């Protein structure tokens, strides 16, 4: 939409803005998801080492 200059470079700036931060929110999410899942990984206790129990 910017090829033929049909928007505001300002505008496109704004669009990329969230599109930038959006994924970051995603990053905030996947980081989040792993967190609990990690805890669910904590649940189902893993032997932190190997050997005779």
């Amino acid at each position: 939409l910017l090829g033929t200059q049909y928007i505001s470079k300002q505008e496109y700036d704004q669009a990329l803005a969230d599109a930038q931060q959006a994924n970051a929110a995603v990053t905030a999410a996947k980081a989040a998801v792993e967190t609990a899942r990690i805890n669910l990984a904590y649940t189902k206790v893993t032997s932190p080492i190997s050997g005779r129990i």
Binding site: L1, G3, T4, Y6
Partner: protein, 49 residues
């Protein structure tokens, strides 16, 4: 008068085209603005119409 009548007309007449001729250009990309915006579907086709 008539001498000055149209001689103005044509000139102002000239100004006419220059406006709309631009104005056409105005709508021109304006159309184009639509089609792309519709081409990408950011906008409807009705607008293009």
């Amino acid at each position: 008068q008539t001498v000055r009548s149209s001689f103005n007309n044509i000139n102002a007449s000239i100004s006419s085209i220059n406006a709309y001729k631009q104005a056409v250009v105005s709508a021109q990309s304006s159309l184009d603005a639509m089609e792309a915006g519709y081409s990408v579907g950011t906008r409807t086709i009705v607008d293009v119409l």
